Every structure is written in structure tokens, then in C-alpha cells.
Swiss-Prot record:
<dbReference type="GO" id="GO:0019871">
    <property type="term" value="F:sodium channel inhibitor activity"/>
</dbReference>
<comment type="similarity">
    <text>Belongs to the conotoxin O1 superfamily.</text>
</comment>
<keyword id="KW-0800">Toxin</keyword>
<comment type="function">
    <text>Delta-conotoxins bind to site 6 of voltage-gated sodium channels and inhibit the inactivation process. This toxin inhibits sodium channel inactivation in neuronal membranes from amphibians and mammals (Nav1.2a/SCN1A, Nav1.3/SCN3A and Nav1.6/SCN8A) upon binding to receptor site 6.</text>
</comment>
<keyword id="KW-0960">Knottin</keyword>
<feature type="disulfide bond">
    <location>
        <begin position="3"/>
        <end position="21"/>
    </location>
</feature>
<keyword id="KW-0964">Secreted</keyword>
<keyword id="KW-0027">Amidation</keyword>
<keyword id="KW-1015">Disulfide bond</keyword>
<dbReference type="GO" id="GO:0005576">
    <property type="term" value="C:extracellular region"/>
</dbReference>
<dbReference type="GO" id="GO:0090729">
    <property type="term" value="F:toxin activity"/>
</dbReference>
<feature type="modified residue" description="Leucine amide">
    <location>
        <position position="32"/>
    </location>
</feature>
<dbReference type="InterPro" id="IPR012322">
    <property type="entry name" value="Conotoxin_d-typ_CS"/>
</dbReference>
<feature type="disulfide bond">
    <location>
        <begin position="10"/>
        <end position="25"/>
    </location>
</feature>
<keyword id="KW-0528">Neurotoxin</keyword>
<protein>
    <recommendedName>
        <fullName>Delta-conotoxin EVIA</fullName>
    </recommendedName>
</protein>
<keyword id="KW-0738">Voltage-gated sodium channel impairing toxin</keyword>
Length: 32
């Protein structure tokens, strides 16, 4: 387990998904 990197790829569907360190995931990790 780890976090996913900001502006690295996570996955979808995003409700719960692999968690980005900057929080937001929408295919790519971002911030919102």
C-alpha cells in the first residue's frame, strides 16, 4: 500500500479508488 503520486495515474471508477497523496483522483491524480 502507498499513495498514488500527484499527476500520476490512478484508475477509475473514482468514489473510493487508489488514493492519491493530493487526494483527488480522476484517472490521473490531481488536487481539487
Amino acid at each position: 500500500d502507498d499513495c498514488i503520486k500527484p499527476y500520476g495515474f490512478c484508475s477509475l471508477p473514482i468514489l473510493k479508488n487508489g488514493l492519491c497523496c493530493s487526494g483527488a483522483c480522476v484517472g490521473v491524480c490531481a488536487d481539487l
